[PDB]
Short mmCIF file of C-alpha atoms in Angstrom, two decimals:
data_model
loop_
_atom_site.label_atom_id
_atom_site.label_comp_id
_atom_site.label_asym_id
_atom_site.label_seq_id
_atom_site.Cartn_x
_atom_site.Cartn_y
_atom_site.Cartn_z
CA UNK S 1 -14.02 -10.37 -26.36
CA UNK S 2 -14.32 -9.00 -22.80
CA UNK S 3 -12.65 -6.43 -20.46
CA UNK S 4 -9.89 -4.67 -22.39
CA UNK S 5 -7.63 -4.38 -19.33
CA UNK S 6 -7.27 -8.17 -19.36
CA UNK S 7 -5.87 -8.50 -22.89
CA UNK S 8 -2.05 -8.83 -23.20
CA UNK S 9 0.11 -5.98 -24.47
CA UNK S 10 3.58 -4.47 -24.28
CA UNK S 11 4.44 -1.58 -21.95
CA UNK S 12 5.36 1.69 -23.70
CA UNK S 13 6.07 5.29 -22.67
CA UNK S 14 8.74 7.46 -21.08
CA UNK S 15 7.49 8.28 -17.61
CA UNK S 16 8.82 11.43 -15.89
CA UNK S 17 11.63 12.42 -13.50
CA UNK S 18 10.55 12.19 -9.84
CA UNK S 19 12.12 12.92 -6.48
CA UNK S 20 11.84 12.12 -2.79
CA UNK S 21 8.21 13.34 -2.70
CA UNK S 22 6.98 11.09 -5.50
CA UNK S 23 4.38 9.33 -3.34
CA UNK S 24 3.34 12.51 -1.58
CA UNK S 25 2.40 13.80 -5.09
CA UNK S 26 -0.05 10.90 -5.38
CA UNK S 27 -2.38 12.71 -3.02
CA UNK S 28 -2.45 15.87 -5.15
CA UNK S 29 -3.72 17.04 -8.56
CA UNK S 30 -3.98 14.14 -11.05
CA UNK S 31 -1.66 11.95 -9.03
CA UNK S 32 2.02 11.16 -9.53
CA UNK S 33 3.46 9.95 -12.88
CA UNK S 34 5.17 6.59 -13.48
CA UNK S 35 8.86 7.35 -12.78
CA UNK S 36 11.18 7.41 -15.77
CA UNK S 37 13.36 4.87 -13.89
CA UNK S 38 10.48 2.39 -13.68
CA UNK S 39 9.48 3.03 -17.29
CA UNK S 40 12.98 2.09 -18.46
CA UNK S 41 12.71 -1.22 -16.61
CA UNK S 42 9.26 -2.20 -17.90
CA UNK S 43 9.31 -0.82 -21.45
CA UNK S 44 8.88 -3.45 -24.18
CA UNK S 45 7.97 -6.18 -21.69
CA UNK S 46 4.71 -8.02 -22.39
CA UNK S 47 2.04 -8.28 -19.68
CA UNK S 48 -0.99 -10.59 -19.64
CA UNK S 49 -3.26 -8.13 -17.86
CA UNK S 50 -3.15 -4.72 -16.23
CA UNK S 51 -3.03 -6.38 -12.84
CA UNK S 52 0.20 -8.16 -13.85
CA UNK S 53 1.64 -4.80 -14.91
CA UNK S 54 0.59 -3.35 -11.52
CA UNK S 55 2.45 -6.13 -9.74
CA UNK S 56 5.62 -5.45 -11.83
CA UNK S 57 5.55 -1.73 -11.04
CA UNK S 58 5.53 -2.33 -7.26
CA UNK S 59 8.19 -5.05 -7.50
CA UNK S 60 10.46 -2.62 -9.39
CA UNK S 61 9.77 0.12 -6.83
CA UNK S 62 10.86 -2.31 -4.09
CA UNK S 63 14.23 -2.63 -5.92
CA UNK S 64 14.74 1.08 -6.59
CA UNK S 65 16.68 2.83 -3.81
CA UNK S 66 15.36 6.30 -4.54
CA UNK S 67 11.73 5.30 -4.96
CA UNK S 68 11.69 2.95 -1.96
CA UNK S 69 13.93 4.79 0.50
CA UNK S 70 10.64 6.61 1.21
CA UNK S 71 8.80 3.45 2.45
CA UNK S 72 9.35 2.06 5.98
CA UNK S 73 10.39 -1.59 6.69
CA UNK S 74 6.83 -2.90 6.73
CA UNK S 75 5.79 -1.14 3.52
CA UNK S 76 9.03 -2.35 1.93
CA UNK S 77 8.02 -5.95 2.81
CA UNK S 78 4.70 -5.40 1.06
CA UNK S 79 6.05 -3.97 -2.24
CA UNK S 80 8.72 -6.67 -2.27
CA UNK S 81 5.81 -9.12 -2.77
CA UNK S 82 4.35 -7.05 -5.61
CA UNK S 83 1.62 -5.63 -3.38
CA UNK S 84 0.76 -1.94 -3.50
CA UNK S 85 2.05 -0.04 -0.45
CA UNK S 86 -0.28 1.39 2.24
CA UNK S 87 -0.94 5.14 2.21
CA UNK S 88 -1.02 7.24 5.40
CA UNK S 89 -4.36 6.86 7.22
CA UNK S 90 -5.55 10.34 6.26
CA UNK S 91 -5.47 9.29 2.58
CA UNK S 92 -7.41 6.01 2.97
CA UNK S 93 -11.12 5.60 2.31
CA UNK S 94 -13.06 2.63 3.57
CA UNK S 95 -11.49 -0.62 2.37
CA UNK S 96 -9.17 1.28 0.00
CA UNK S 97 -5.92 1.65 1.97
CA UNK S 98 -3.14 1.33 -0.64
CA UNK S 99 -1.77 3.49 -3.50
CA UNK S 100 -3.75 3.02 -6.71
CA UNK S 101 -2.78 3.01 -10.41
CA UNK S 102 -5.29 4.66 -12.74
CA UNK S 103 -5.58 5.65 -16.37
CA UNK S 104 -5.54 9.38 -17.14
CA UNK S 105 -7.47 8.99 -20.41
CA UNK S 106 -9.91 6.15 -19.55
CA UNK S 107 -9.49 2.83 -21.36
CA UNK S 108 -13.24 2.97 -22.15
CA UNK S 109 -12.58 6.23 -24.02
CA UNK S 110 -9.59 5.00 -26.00
CA UNK S 111 -6.81 5.34 -23.45
CA UNK S 112 -3.99 2.81 -23.81
CA UNK S 113 -3.81 0.16 -21.09
CA UNK S 114 -0.04 -0.25 -20.93
CA UNK S 115 1.09 3.20 -22.01
CA UNK S 116 3.01 4.40 -18.95
CA UNK S 117 2.53 8.03 -19.97
CA UNK S 118 -1.23 7.36 -19.53
CA UNK S 119 -0.92 5.94 -15.99
CA UNK S 120 -0.93 7.89 -12.70
CA UNK S 121 -0.43 6.85 -9.06
CA UNK S 122 -3.05 8.24 -6.63
CA UNK S 123 -4.11 7.77 -3.04
CA UNK S 124 -7.70 6.48 -2.53
CA UNK S 125 -8.81 9.87 -1.22
CA UNK S 126 -7.36 11.75 -4.20
CA UNK S 127 -8.92 9.40 -6.77
CA UNK S 128 -12.27 9.92 -5.07
CA UNK S 129 -11.87 13.72 -4.77
CA UNK S 130 -10.96 13.86 -8.45
CA UNK S 131 -14.18 12.15 -9.54
CA UNK B 3 -10.17 -15.24 19.70
CA UNK B 4 -10.22 -12.40 17.18
CA UNK B 5 -13.23 -10.48 18.39
CA UNK B 6 -11.42 -8.02 20.69
CA UNK B 7 -7.92 -7.35 21.93
CA UNK B 8 -8.79 -8.77 25.39
CA UNK B 9 -9.18 -12.11 23.55
CA UNK B 10 -5.46 -11.96 22.62
CA UNK B 11 -2.55 -12.79 24.91
CA UNK B 12 0.30 -10.29 24.32
CA UNK B 13 2.35 -13.05 22.64
CA UNK B 14 -0.52 -13.81 20.27
CA UNK B 15 -0.93 -10.16 19.34
CA UNK B 16 2.81 -9.91 18.64
CA UNK B 17 2.45 -12.87 16.27
CA UNK B 18 -0.27 -10.96 14.40
CA UNK B 19 1.80 -7.79 14.20
CA UNK B 20 4.87 -9.75 13.07
CA UNK B 21 2.86 -11.37 10.26
CA UNK B 22 1.68 -7.92 9.10
CA UNK B 23 5.12 -6.31 9.28
CA UNK B 24 6.68 -9.08 7.21
CA UNK B 25 3.74 -9.17 4.76
CA UNK B 26 3.57 -12.92 5.44
CA UNK B 27 0.39 -13.47 3.43
CA UNK B 28 -0.61 -15.13 0.20
CA UNK B 29 -2.33 -12.06 -1.26
CA UNK B 30 -2.66 -8.30 -0.86
CA UNK B 31 -6.32 -8.85 0.12
CA UNK B 32 -5.13 -11.03 3.01
CA UNK B 33 -2.70 -8.35 4.15
CA UNK B 34 -5.34 -5.60 3.96
CA UNK B 35 -7.70 -7.82 5.98
CA UNK B 36 -5.09 -8.24 8.73
CA UNK B 37 -4.32 -4.52 8.84
CA UNK B 38 -8.03 -3.68 9.03
CA UNK B 39 -8.38 -6.24 11.85
CA UNK B 40 -5.36 -4.67 13.66
CA UNK B 41 -7.03 -1.25 13.45
CA UNK B 42 -10.34 -2.55 14.79
CA UNK B 43 -8.60 -4.38 17.65
CA UNK B 44 -6.38 -1.55 18.82
CA UNK B 45 -8.96 1.24 18.44
CA UNK B 46 -5.97 3.54 18.19
CA UNK B 47 -6.46 6.92 16.36
CA UNK B 48 -3.40 6.45 14.11
CA UNK B 49 -4.85 3.29 12.62
CA UNK B 50 -2.42 1.61 10.23
CA UNK B 51 0.03 4.48 10.62
CA UNK B 52 1.27 2.74 13.75
CA UNK B 53 2.68 0.15 11.33
CA UNK B 54 3.61 2.09 8.20
CA UNK B 55 4.17 5.72 9.32
CA UNK B 56 5.60 5.78 12.89
CA UNK B 57 6.01 9.01 14.86
CA UNK B 58 9.51 10.47 15.19
CA UNK B 59 11.41 8.23 17.58
CA UNK B 60 8.93 5.35 17.79
CA UNK B 61 10.08 1.75 17.76
CA UNK B 62 8.39 0.46 14.61
CA UNK B 63 9.68 -3.12 15.00
CA UNK B 64 6.84 -5.58 15.73
CA UNK B 65 7.70 -5.51 19.44
CA UNK B 66 7.85 -1.71 19.43
CA UNK B 67 4.39 -1.52 17.88
CA UNK B 68 2.92 -3.92 20.47
CA UNK B 69 4.39 -1.78 23.26
CA UNK B 70 2.92 1.41 21.76
CA UNK B 71 -0.49 -0.28 21.53
CA UNK B 72 -0.15 -1.69 25.08
CA UNK B 73 0.74 1.65 26.62
CA UNK B 74 -1.85 3.57 24.69
CA UNK B 75 -4.75 1.32 25.70
CA UNK B 76 -3.72 1.39 29.35
CA UNK B 77 -3.42 5.18 29.36
CA UNK B 78 -6.77 5.56 27.64
CA UNK B 79 -8.91 3.39 29.92
CA UNK B 80 -9.30 0.49 27.53
CA UNK B 81 -9.10 -3.21 28.36
CA UNK B 82 -5.74 -4.88 27.76
CA UNK B 83 -4.44 -8.28 26.69
CA UNK B 84 -5.78 -11.57 27.99
CA UNK B 85 -4.22 -12.87 31.20
#
């Protein structure tokens, strides 16, 4: 019985409508929400760990014309492999150079691991500035 | 060989940039490592933006990126590629 984020579960939640500035929103407030489009594609699927869910989110973004049209060729190559895309330099911190997925209500405080309404996308700088 | 940009021939540096652009790695960690290495080698102010967030009208193909790095280092009094 260790690390809750590594136990399997099914993805749930509605996500929210987003536009062309979805990733720009990741550097503001509490970060950007999981897009409703992505939530429809992942809902009900079972994931072995949060990291596997993370990989599925980026792979779906790489196949979504609206959500990806905002990534250049090189970033598109990265998300196509399930990797998180790089943020602009001004939003990186140390070795943290890619967009991050975090839980709004922490898992250690009862937040659900695979509830997409409990997940936000943030840049490294924003996640740091928040805490 | 990978200590400074003067250790790289221009063809070798293009191979590095091409690998990054195509995300030709076996893990995200490997890609981040290469990007960090690219930043350290070029010493350019834009850092990884040269690869992922090009300026209006910049050639962001691997060859375009090498050219931007080449010109910038020359114009800023830095050593260039080997040979």
